[PDB]
Design a protein around this nucleic acid. Structure first.
Lengths: 345, 56
DNA sequence: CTTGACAAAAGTGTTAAATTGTGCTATACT
């Protein structure tokens, strides 16, 4: 059981007393301001030196080689900035150390409040997303809450954290739970719809109609709109969904293929092309060529008027008269043979 | 569990890396760690701590 | 086979509406 594993793993790392909390926050902010001061030192960006320090902290070679096969070279752009930051006087140096310690503090803080996140994610199940996924989204929301936190406001970090964890988990339901992608706006919309529907179903004693629920939704809401949003809200169906009491049948294998031509269809198209080819041959050579230039029987494209006139060297009007005439001659011979009178669907 | 090494002038080593007995600690070769272990540079006490562990 | 005159159809470039993606909130809460 993975849940047991992770829960025990975070059960290992203890909580944090107010002293520890405030001290860690302090050390973090000191670290960041140290990074900024180092940005005024060597003249490089904050996140640059930050990610370098991380690369010296949360693992040696493992931060670089696998966030995908290509990021920032190990011996080259990492180590040269490292050595460049190495070559500074005493104050900037002590600030380097301070920065590193800040990073570590950030990590620990993150852990205790991972326990917190686990509580919050424990609140949110039923999703359309699994428990551990909830935990992890909440954990990212936790790293996020840690980054922007300010201890000077003298508030317990737990509250600020909770808000961020919650919003992160909601970002999960919005971005995940449904097989098809439904963006945030209509997710919230659907939620409001269902909520209100529940409310007036409680009131009226029965399910509503699109009209009354639309009116209960306020302005801009009609029957068609709630019907449409409800049409989007519905989920796909599993192809493996069992049909009947039989164990030999699925739902998906009862689905026909209209994308693929049936033998009768291929034969139909064949006979059409052939019979049309033979019914074409009784025309004059030029008019037939013109026709099959118009139809796409040559390159598949449609050569207009002027194009045909350009290829045969004549005017476009002549081409027009030509094709009309062809059409009527085919009218005669087809009025006779009745071979092509079909294919009329 | 550790061995303490107070310094004076800056430091060569940084928090978290690896040192072997005889390797150079702070003050330009003034103090060396005689023991295998991870090294932590402490600002407040102005000291270099070597906690014995193997880099494994 | 030809030409010129015309509108309907299909194009082409700037704008408005709605659409979607991203971030944020501080009693405390593990």
């Amino acid at each position: 059981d993975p849940v047991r594993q992770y829960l025990h793993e975070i059960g290992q790392v203890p909580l944090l007393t107010l002293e520890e909390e405030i001290d860690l926050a302090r050390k973090v902010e000191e670290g960041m301001e140290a990074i900024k001061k180092l940005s005024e030192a060597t003249g490089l960006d904050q996140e640059l030196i930050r990610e370098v320090v991380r690369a010296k902290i949360l693992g040696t070679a493992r931060i670089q080689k696998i966030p995908g096969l290509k990021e920032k070279p190990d011996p080259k752009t990492v180590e040269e900035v490292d050595g460049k930051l190495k070559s500074l006087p005493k104050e900037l140096k002590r600030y380097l150390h301070i920065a590193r310690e800040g990073e570590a503090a950030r990590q620990h803080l993150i852990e205790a409040n991972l326990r917190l996140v686990v509580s919050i994610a424990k609140k949110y199940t039923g999703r359309g997303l699994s428990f551990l996924d909830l935990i992890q989204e909440g954990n990212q929301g936790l790293i996020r809450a840690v980054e922007k936190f300010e201890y000077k406001r003298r508030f317990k970090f737990s509250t600020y954290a909770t808000w961020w964890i919650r919003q992160a988990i909601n970002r999960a339901i919005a971005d995940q739970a449904r097989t098809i992608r439904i963006p945030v706006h209509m997710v919230e919309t659907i939620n409001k719809l269902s909520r209100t529907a529940r409310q007036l179903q409680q009131e009226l004693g029965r399910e509503p109609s699109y009209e009354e629920i639309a009116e209960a939704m306020g302005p801009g809401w009609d029957a068609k709109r709630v019907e449409e949003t409800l049409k989007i809200a519905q989920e796909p169906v599993s192809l493996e969904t069992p049909i009947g009491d039989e164990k030999d049948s699925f739902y998906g294998d009862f689905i026909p293929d209209e994308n693929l031509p049936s033998p009768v269809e291929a034969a139909a198209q064949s006979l059409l092309s052939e019979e049309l080819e033979k019914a074409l041959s009784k025309l004059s050579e030029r008019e037939a060529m013109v026709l099959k230039l118009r139809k796409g029987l040559i390159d598949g494209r449609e050569h207009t008027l002027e194009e045909v006139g350009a290829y045969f060297g004549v005017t476009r009007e002549r081409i027009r008269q030509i094709e009309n005439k062809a059409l009527r001659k085919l009218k005669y011979h087809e009025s006779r043979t009745r071979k092509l009178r079909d294919f009329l669907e | 569990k550790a061995r303490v090494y107070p310094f004076e002038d800056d430091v060569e080593v940084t928090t978290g890396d690896r040192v072997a007995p005889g390797d150079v600690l702070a003050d330009g070769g003034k103090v060396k760690s005689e023991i295998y272990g991870r090294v932590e540079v402490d600002l407040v006490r102005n000291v270099v701590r070597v906690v014995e562990s193997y880099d494994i």
